[PDB]
Design a binder for this molecule. Structure first.
Ligand code: FE
Ligand code: FE
Lengths: 204, 210
């Protein structure tokens, strides 16, 4: 009962042809639903069912030892997907965020290449992230459903994500099959930079 | 180059309807090919180019530290898929083993049906990308799983498990997504129809010879 599946900000076909509608529906109603269901099961009987998911995943070292794995995977899955839907919409940043991107990466085009590289070289399942770390932007990747908010010890990297892309094969296989780089190029067309900017201002 | 893409023992549509022809083709000519190509790149400037792949993956500590990850992933990828193609077949068998292998399964797991349950459970609980395996470990059968392209031959320190694999199923989403989408359990149930138990039994007999 802790978490519910969030509604999408747009119809399943709103991100076409960049992301197919069938993928959106399955990704949402099956994959994301499963993380919600399994996180809920894991949270029953604990003192952690009342925390927002993004706070729970920052407290994985405090949960019961036998629940840590399940919560890392499933609360991570829920946090990651919840953000993912919101940072897309039906294309460049501006204002303070663009300035930060320019400073950290040289240019928006250079940032894109770095972000794409991190996504491409992530072997197996996982995510690539733009994070705010000590007030500065960086590009990182994580395995499976790990999130940089989980911290160094668990996720391998840290910082507050403001943008992420799902590079699990489920995110792209129906439309792109093996062609992850084509998926990643097409992703830039659906990023909601207004939402990413809101998250940057917040993280700063 | 050190490695080449092996030919399949059957046509791309030979495992229909259990595994779709399109998947077989892409899995073979794109995914497996990429593992071959990238392994070949990492081996180009080394003394490891002449080893059979199954020996190379057993020697990953020996390799230069800067090549270790690349070889783990890509040599592992090549070893895994090379075995995968050989342990499936068309018009097999319900499909099940017999003889010494079946006796060993009954001994280790209680029955073939119990083994299937245990193997499906290991494959289902492998979170993210990886493989489930039937291994011979100290002369006895066990069911284990690995992450990504890790293989039990790599040893416990690298792969988290050990033993000689005699059967494995690919549970990377690319192995099943076109035909089954999220339904990994449906894929796993169909997989039993294409296992070549004659080949698995050959590998068992060899593994038990010490
Ligand atoms: Fe996903
Ligand atoms: Fe594969």
């Amino acid at each position: 009962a802790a978490y519910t599946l969030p509604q999408l900000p747009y119809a399943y076909d709103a991100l076409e042809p960049h992301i197919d509608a069938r993928t959106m529906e399955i990704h949402h109603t099956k994959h994301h639903q499963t993380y919600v269901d399994n996180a809920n099961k894991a949270l029953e009987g604990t003192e952690f069912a009342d925390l927002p998911v993004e706070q729970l995943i920052q407290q994985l070292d405090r949960v019961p030892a036998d629940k840590k794995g399940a919560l890392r995977n499933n609360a991570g899955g829920h946090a990651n997907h919840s953000m993912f839907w919101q940072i897309m919409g039906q294309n460049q940043p501006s204002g303070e965020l663009l300035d930060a991107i320019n400073s950290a990466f040289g240019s928006f085009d250079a940032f894109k290449q770095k972000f794409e590289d991190a996504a491409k070289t992530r072997f197996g399942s996982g995510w690539a992230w733009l994070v705010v770390k000590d007030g500065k932007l960086d590009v990182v990747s994580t395995a499976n459903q790990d999130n940089p908010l989980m911290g160094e010890a668990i996720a391998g990297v840290s910082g507050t994500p403001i943008l992420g892309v799902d590079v699990w094969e489920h995110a792209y296989y129906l439309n792109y099959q093996n062609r992850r780089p084509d998926y990643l190029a097409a992703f830039w067309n659906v990023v909601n930079w207004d939402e990413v900017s809101k998250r940057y201002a917040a993280a700063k």
